[PDB]
Amino acid sequence: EVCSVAFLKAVFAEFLATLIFVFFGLGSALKWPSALPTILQIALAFGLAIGTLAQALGPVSGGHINPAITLALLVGNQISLLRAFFYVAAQLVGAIAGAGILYGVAPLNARGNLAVNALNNNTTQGQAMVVELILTFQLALCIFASTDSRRTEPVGSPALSIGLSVTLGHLVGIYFTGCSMNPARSFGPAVVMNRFSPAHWVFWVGPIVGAVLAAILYFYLLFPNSLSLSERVAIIKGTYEP
Amino acid sequence: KKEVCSVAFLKAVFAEFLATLIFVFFGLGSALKWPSALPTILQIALAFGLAIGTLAQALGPVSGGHINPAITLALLVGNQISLLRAFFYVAAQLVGAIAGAGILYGVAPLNARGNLAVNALNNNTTQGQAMVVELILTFQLALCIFASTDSRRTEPVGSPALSIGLSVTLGHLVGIYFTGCSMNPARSFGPAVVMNRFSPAHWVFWVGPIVGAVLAAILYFYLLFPNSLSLSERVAIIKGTYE
Amino acid sequence: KKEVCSVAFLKAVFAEFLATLIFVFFGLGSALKWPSALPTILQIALAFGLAIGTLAQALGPVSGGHINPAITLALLVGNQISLLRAFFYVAAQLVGAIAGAGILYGVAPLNARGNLAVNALNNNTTQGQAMVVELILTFQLALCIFASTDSRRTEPVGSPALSIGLSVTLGHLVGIYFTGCSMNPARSFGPAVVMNRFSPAHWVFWVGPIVGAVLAAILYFYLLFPNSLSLSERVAIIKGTYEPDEWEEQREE
Amino acid sequence: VCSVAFLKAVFAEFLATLIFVFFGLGSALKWPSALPTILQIALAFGLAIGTLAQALGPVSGGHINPAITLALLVGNQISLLRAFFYVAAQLVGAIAGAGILYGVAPLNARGNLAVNALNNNTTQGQAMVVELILTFQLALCIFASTDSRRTEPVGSPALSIGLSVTLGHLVGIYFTGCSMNPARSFGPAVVMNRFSPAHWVFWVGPIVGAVLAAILYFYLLFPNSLSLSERVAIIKGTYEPDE
């Protein structure tokens, strides 16, 4: 699995995409002096960044760009444990790259905090944890319905469908935590500007738990695969034919 | 007599509960009176509609994806579903819709609470003038739901869930300006359950959607594109004993 | 003669009445001068284009779904419909537009009703200018509608209604700063009759869209993607008889 | 070149780039009635590509962008002469679209005919790197959407490509007014006759970014598997596979 050429491209796509998703998301959501971006303006910019990069590099990788989605798929028994590590690693590296790039290009009067995930003052950690859970649970459940081959119903454009599920997440999430759902999107500018949150665990735990719940529902409860124990073991190592 | 014993039904009812819940949370949540930056009309419209259009793509394959008692009844009135299904489905939708606003209650900050974005009248416009519009909104929506769930279509549908989502966004682009846009009893009931009794124009948000949805269910499923079946099988549907 | 008296054609023009009722109801309804919060340019444009795009999906299989006498009278010149199909459609679109505009006045209160989202020129844009815009605003819309609904298309069309619907929106994002964006003569003639006001340049709102749509047909149908049919076949279409058909139903095998 | 299909294709590149530059620039004028918002301008520019793809895409390929034309020629999808006359058509079409706007636009809203303006806090070097990333991502979507080898559900190539221009504009506006299109930069620059010393960025930025995406797509990521004779034949303009 790991030594093949398809595995090299697939992981590169996750790095490359997460770079651009983070560059465009953060770049669009800076406190620009020309005109401070609106809540819709931001929410579409992320959900067009996910919807565009799904269409481009979803053939190459799978189009995760998201540790939570990757980990949800892993817990759902959709991917190998080796993949999960490299994908997640590529995403986390890519996010730092994209954040890093933005640091260079943007003028100071815009830059500020590089659009890090700021928790709202009236909002708490335990409150913001349940939001990032939901925000990512619907995105996870949207993805898995949109890219299950067993579906007979008309999917249409799962690129711009999954894309818009991000824009849905941002029009609520901007208020509670500045929106995250992607642990890499949080971890990117936190490393570049070199400043973590006290509630940075929320941006990991919330989405990673939120996404895994969707996977537990969709892949075991609602739409089971019906495979033997030894069939499932070979999938996680990376030796499934079928 | 029967369609309940199957686990496919058990999943289908829960999927409505689960779906209806999230639509409310995101609809209301996007609609809350945010002091950080109050939501524009276009914003609230998109967030409401993209909630439906995503949930259709997610749980439409599991439950049909009504996410609304108006469509649940207008599918019973159009002869698309049995009695015992629409009994449990609206039972799921309302139960779900309560939990969804109640979680927004359980998380939202007190400065942004505002109203919990509940449906409330315009002072310049009467209860009659508002009852007229809730027909129009759910009519065109149900017409578009029924048209895009019709398997007979040879025309290129392309994207069902996004076109249904953009119908709900079209619904709010004008329907916010009157009552806050119901197009949905569970969306207007669920949050208003956090109080006690009925408000002044509460009947408007039940009759308006259910009537509107049924007029498309007459026009589409009886007049425009009928079915041509016997009363032996039309009764077998309503019981739920059809193959 | 038989084409008209069939039960298929009853629903085929009734849907144009019901569509243009709902289009000019929703479209104009988002563009009122509201007190609560004045609708933005992007908020208007989307509501018009999504009205088109939501109706074209729902009542596309019924009538085809023009919801526009500029579009219908371009199909007649492009040789896609009969002369009695084009006549009865245009009537129901203008009757629908006035029927919708009538229902809109009946709910919108004193304060908000205002001028009922009627079209009007920009103060620095003359009649010599404003017609050239409304041509191009609708030329592009026709070209999208033709290429999206043409069954000769090999490429993946996607969703045809939304693709078309968001060409109306795109028309509004420029059109409002010149006219309030008509692109549809019925959407001008819908409110103008109800509130009982016509301008010194209402000739721009009729001729501009229809001419733009018809000049797209000359390009698309005759230059870009030609037909290859005889003069007898062209006259057969205009009068309203053409074969072969598909799935005529009935027996026997 | 002498063929009838080439005429229509080159004419459609003129006509589309003309209609693109009209709709692109006109939505972002100094409108005294109501100044255009940022999301509005992104959606205007974006949907012009997402509509002219649907219409004139079948005719020409739906380039409307000398950077995308040159990227494909490097990636090995067209002949030398096809690109030459495509670029010429786009650049002329752009000037026509702008020179058309000179007549119809009023004086009070006019502005500078909406030419790309480099944010004066940002340098030449930085603007180039954004314009690269704006156009690299645009082209990298295009090639995947328009790839006939695609097994995945394609969606509407037209719409997903138009929104990559929207996405492009959501960030690019703050740096340059967003170009990603040497003709859209050149077009209004000839009508008003206003060339900055920083005009080279609008050519070099998108072109370099588009070339990288093509090289990455067609050679590295998704290989072709064809001989040099077939590749030279594509550059010279002589090819016909299957029936």
Residue numbers in the entry:
A (entry chain C): 4 to 245
B (entry chain A): 2 to 244
C (entry chain D): 2 to 254
D (entry chain B): 5 to 247
What did the original publication write about this model?
The flux of water across biological membranes is facilitated by transmembrane protein channels called aquaporins (AQPs). AQP5 is found in tissues such as the lungs, airways and secretory glands and consequently plays a major role in the generation of saliva, tears and pulmonary secretions. There are two consensus PKA sites in AQP5: Ser 156 in cytoplasmic loop D and Thr 259 in the carboxy-terminus; the latter corresponds to Ser 256 in AQP2. Based on the crystal structure of human AQP5 it was hypothesized that phosphorylation of Ser 156 could cause structural changes in loop D that would break its interaction with the carboxy-terminus, thereby flagging the protein for translocation to the plasma membrane.
Finally, we have used x-ray crystallography to show that the phosphomimetic S156E mutation does not cause any significant structural changes to the protein as previously suggested. For full-length AQP5 S156E, additional electron density could be seen beyond Pro 245 in one of the monomers (monomer D), allowing us to build nine more residues. However, this region does not interact with any other residues within the tetramer. Instead, it forms crystal contacts with symmetry-related AQP5 molecules in the crystal packing, explaining why this region is ordered in this particular monomer of the full-length structure. For full-length AQP5 S156E, the limited resolution prevented the identification of water molecules in the channel. In both structures, a lipid molecule could be observed in the central channel formed between monomers in the tetramer, albeit at slightly different positions. Similarly to wild-type AQP5, this lipid was modelled as phosphatidyl serine. We therefore suggest that it is the presence of a phosphate group at Ser 156 rather than a conformational change of the carboxy-terminus that is recognized as a sorting signal, resulting in increased AQP5 membrane abundance.
